[PDB]
Symmetry: C2
Amino acid sequence: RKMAFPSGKVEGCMVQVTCGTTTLNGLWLDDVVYCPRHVICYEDLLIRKSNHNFLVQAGNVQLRVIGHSMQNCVLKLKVDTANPKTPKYKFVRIQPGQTFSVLACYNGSPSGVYQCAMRPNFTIKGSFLNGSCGSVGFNIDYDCVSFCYMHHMELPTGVHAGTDLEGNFYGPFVDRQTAQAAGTDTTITVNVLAWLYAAVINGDRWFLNRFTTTLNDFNLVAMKYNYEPLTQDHVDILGPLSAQTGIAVLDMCASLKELLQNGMNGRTILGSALLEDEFTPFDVVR
Amino acid sequence: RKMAFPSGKVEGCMVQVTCGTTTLNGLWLDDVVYCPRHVICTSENMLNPNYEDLLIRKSNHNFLVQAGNVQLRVIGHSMQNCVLKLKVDTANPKTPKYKFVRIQPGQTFSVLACYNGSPSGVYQCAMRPNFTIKGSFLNGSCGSVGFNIDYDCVSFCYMHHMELPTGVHAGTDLEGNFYGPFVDRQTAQAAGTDTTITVNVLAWLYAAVINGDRWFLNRFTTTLNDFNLVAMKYNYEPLTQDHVDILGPLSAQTGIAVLDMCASLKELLQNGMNGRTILGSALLEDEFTPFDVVR
């Protein structure tokens, strides 16, 4: 099973932000609420705004905006009181292929939690309800919350686009009503390899063969099947799993090369009949 | 996406229960800690434990309960079926609004997997028709609980007790009664043949229609009897008139009669997916309920 992180620490940070007739989710940390700047639908639009234009609700309580400011594509609303439920936290930016949990929220109220990967085309295959704008993604490492994502937009193909918590978009997207579409996506090779290592650790070994391939030879098969190219960085990352199982990375790649041409052939790997790519090497170790 | 419930209300209830050399998770609600009774078992007891004999020999101070950095004082103990119930000094300040419920096969719920009392991950689940859980249980997840959350009220429906030889998981409701024919004993017990939850696949196909996908529909219908004769050859659960009644609302919203959706499923089982996907899945998904789909 994919598992999401326990969401309790983030749940106590979610609030509702309303400007005019538009309402979405915000993240309340210390005395600042963070939310997508498109709540004010940007240089002009925010000069004309004053504090009384923003209504922040932390459950029953209304919060008083005493200052506002923009950072890239996120609005930073300073409020009268600090969130007593603020966890230890940091803002971080992730890379395609890395995984995180999303707390989907409806008008400030947490609705559900799921585990994601940042796709190579920088979008998120998520299930986002009406009014989930401003929901955040995060990892938890030893009671420290690493916030890595804030949801902004649904793209026509169903997937989702957002920013880091400093307002920098992931991917070539803008927060305007322009026609935009996800680029062609790609399977995350290093995560498939990690998931095959987890299958071996779990006793699934039928796909193991006696052969080894080269980095160059694999990457040609990889692009023929729309797979991210494998780097020496990926190989080194999978090192602990190769040590743990005795299967070298380029021998697992031969295994993967055969899977991409024969299929599981009525067999399964860990119960699936497709190759899972939303588990990172780190995820498998933990 | 399959989503789990936000886990915060349950995280504040998780504690660690230690008895002798055995440690697992407990659930701290008001002034009672619930946990699996095999916490009182040693190695030499697993095969044929006599729980009433083992429990009579314990006193309150044999039970070390820890809520984070704080030891809770046990002031009484009692056994109800296969759950131990430890009365403590202190009512949990973070006790949510809650109830205990017993669920049926096909029902879904979230599991907060914990290790030694600390929550580690959350996932969404279905009770399989053979009364097991296809869980993801780290080495010390005994006593982790499953739940639903409706309008801020938590329904506790499952407590984890053991992994079966086939990799799946068995456990009880919060009254200590096992789901299925399993026992908290290290015997040669095995899960029955697992079947697909038919009513959940059909509800999900209705969810595919509501989301615009219709490629799998066909012009046929079927009788209920004929549908079940076919589906059982694929290890699908028989569909009852109650299931039909339950899908009525989704049949209403989509204009597709239940037995017409059944004919579509019969053909999907005959043909496979032909490399296509239905919602975002290339598999027939059976862990979303009719109730879930309306949400």
